[PDB]
Amino acid sequence: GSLTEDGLSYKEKFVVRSYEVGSNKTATVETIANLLQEVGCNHAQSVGFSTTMRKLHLIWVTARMHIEIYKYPAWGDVVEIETWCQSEGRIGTRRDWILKDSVTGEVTGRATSKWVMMNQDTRRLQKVSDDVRDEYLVFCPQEPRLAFPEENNRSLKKIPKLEDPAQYSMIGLKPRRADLDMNQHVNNVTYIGWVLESIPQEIVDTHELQVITLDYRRECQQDDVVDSLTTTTSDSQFLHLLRLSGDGQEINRGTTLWRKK
Amino acid sequence: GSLTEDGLSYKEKFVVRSYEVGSNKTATVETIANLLQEVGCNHAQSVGFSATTTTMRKLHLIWVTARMHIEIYKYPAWGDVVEIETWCQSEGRIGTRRDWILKDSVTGEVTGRATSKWVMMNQDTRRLQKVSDDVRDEYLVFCPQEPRLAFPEENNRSLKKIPKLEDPAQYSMIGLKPRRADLDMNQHVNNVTYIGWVLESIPQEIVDTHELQVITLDYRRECQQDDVVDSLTTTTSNDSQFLHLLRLSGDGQEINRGTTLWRKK
Ligand SMILES: NS(=O)(=O)c1ccccc1F
Numbered sequence: 210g211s212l213t214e215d216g217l218s219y220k221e222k223f224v225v226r227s228y229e230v231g232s233n234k235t236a237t238v239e240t241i242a243n244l245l246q247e248v249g250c251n252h253a254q255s256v257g258f259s260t261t262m263r264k265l266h267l268i269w270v271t272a273r274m275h276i277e278i279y280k281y282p283a284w285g286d287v288v289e290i291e292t293w294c295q296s297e298g299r300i301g302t303r304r305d306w307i308l309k310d311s312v313t314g315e316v317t318g319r320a321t322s323k324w325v326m327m328n329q330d331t332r333r334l335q336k337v338s339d340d341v342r343d344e345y346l347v348f349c350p351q352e353p354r355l356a357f358p359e360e361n362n363r364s365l366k367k368i369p370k371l372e373d374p375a376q377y378s379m380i381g382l383k384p385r386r387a388d389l390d391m392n393q394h395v396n397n398v399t400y401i402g403w404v405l406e407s408i409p410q411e412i413v414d415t416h417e418l419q420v421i422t423l424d425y426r427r428e429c430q431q432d433d434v435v436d437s438l439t440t441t442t443s444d445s446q447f448l449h450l451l452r453l454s455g456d457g458q459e460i461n462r463g464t465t466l467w468r469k470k
Numbered sequence: 471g472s473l474t475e476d477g478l479s480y481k482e483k484f485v486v487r488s489y490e491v492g493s494n495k496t497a498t499v500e501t502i503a504n505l506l507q508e509v510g511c512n513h514a515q516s517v518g519f520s521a522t523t524t525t526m527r528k529l530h531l532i533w534v535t536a537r538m539h540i541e542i543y544k545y546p547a548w549g550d551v552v553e554i555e556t557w558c559q560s561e562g563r564i565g566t567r568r569d570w571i572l573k574d575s576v577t578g579e580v581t582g583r584a585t586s587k588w589v590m591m592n593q594d595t596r597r598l599q600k601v602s603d604d605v606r607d608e609y610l611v612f613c614p615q616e617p618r619l620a621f622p623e624e625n626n627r628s629l630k631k632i633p634k635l636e637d638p639a640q641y642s643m644i645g646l647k648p649r650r651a652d653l654d655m656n657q658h659v660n661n662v663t664y665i666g667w668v669l670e671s672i673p674q675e676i677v678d679t680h681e682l683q684v685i686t687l688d689y690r691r692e693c694q695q696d697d698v699v700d701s702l703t704t705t706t707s708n709d710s711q712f713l714h715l716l717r718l719s720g721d722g723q724e725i726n727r728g729t730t731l732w733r734k735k
Pocket residue numbers: 242243245246249271273274304322397398401
């Protein structure tokens with residue numbers, strides 16, 4: 210991969226792997242999500258960032274992830290992904306992505322993520338300071354560059370809390386070592402897989418996932434156990450909730466949109 | 471990737487990904503195992519295979535893994551390039567074997583090696599059979615004629631008999647279930663998930679203070695999508711060795727057994 214000519218964005222090509230595809234012989238949404246995280250980490254490395262504010266014990270954390278896929282790439286196909294960041298004042302930052310078929314050059318998908326500033330110890334959120342905002346802006350486009358430009362778009366919709374009883378459920382989900390990152394935290398993509406576990410297999414077999422919006426409220430520790438809840442709100446639409454198996458503490462909520470194959 | 475000059479083996483380079491590494495900032499053994507499976511599948515595609523030959527397909531016959539043996543000297547770091555060479559060989563009527571050599575692309579040194587034993591089985595009845603002469607003929611043309619072993623040694627670890635763990639196990643991890651990401655394109659649990667499940671019953675302290683050097687895993691029975699597994703481990707031993715057993719959470723039916731060797735970091 211490499212930064213573009215202006216140095217304000219980053220592109221990388223990936224060849225789809227055999228173990229990365231599902232029953233349709235095309236990449237799963239978790240393979241897509243992993244590739245988005247990888248090109249994001251590679252963009253961070255290219256401009257000197259770690260996966261000045263380290264002394265204050267301050268980190269960026271994901272609050273929301275929104276992904277829309279038009280075509281999933283097949284095993285052996287090449288996918289090109291362009292990514293870039295932008296500041297949103299004191300709320301936090303945003304990382305966007307565009308996915309293209311390397312052969313046709315057509316847009317096959319797009320994604321956007323909202324990130325907030327928090328203390329690594331204490332987990333307390335904060336507004337972004339001017340000192341941080343200054344050294345961040347030099348690696349971003351100055352004029353707004355949105356993967357989802359449309360006024361009143363799906364990526365900015367408020368998500369409601371699922372009411373008991375859920376229509377569907379998958380209980381007792383636990384992360385294994387493969388679900389952790391190099392810093393021993395559960396990888397954000399595992400939460401997507403856990404959300405989708407409560408979708409019935411018949412919907413998976415007859416529909417393709419088109420849109421997924423996921424809010425990240427609280428981290429799942431290594432020794433925690435999660436319950437995945439899903440209720441049909443409708444094309445098929447679902448409302449999702451991930452909560453701790455015991456006390457019911459919310460870790461995530463989201464929505465998915467599926468189209469008939 | 472590409473087949474070598476003689477067309478009897480296949481090489482491929484991989485750049486290690488951020489989500490593929492562990493706490494040591496180096497690839498996990500499951501990332502290594504996935505790369506071995508990927509270069510194997512790419513070698514199959516390069517010479518016109520699904521691993522089923524044209525004769526196996528009509529008879530609903532498939533190759534299935536019976537044993538996987540991996541030895542790692544150095545795990546590659548995030549951003550490093552690893553080169554993997556793979557090849558197959560027939561073992562008469564017992565079945566076939568797929569071997570691999572892992573090298574650092576920069577230094578050219580061997581950083582690891584692996585070997586796997588495969589048996590012929592009917593896809594539907596799950597009944598094993600000996601390799602027919604007709605299948606051995608169209609297989610041989612894609613393999614080296616002279617023996618080429620990743621583990622040549624006279625007393626190598628890859629061919630050792632594995633005993634069954636006795637209750638009570640020293641360590642255990644209970645109620646493990648595959649999720650959709652653990653399945654392959656054919657909806658079967660990916661062989662690498664079983665490695666992850668075996669390692670789940672190793673205490674976190676051993677992981678934190680030791681590097682895994684050798685793993686030998688026997689595959690007795692497949693875990694279905696709706697099955698639940700228990701992972702059991704007992705210390706058998708500066709080097710630490712363990713005996714492993716994966717069995718169904720209910721009736722205790724054995725799915726896998728194996729051994730691991732770990733060295734102090
Ligand atoms: N925004 S992120 O952390 O790169 C991310 C990527 C993919 C899935 C979920 C995520 F949160």
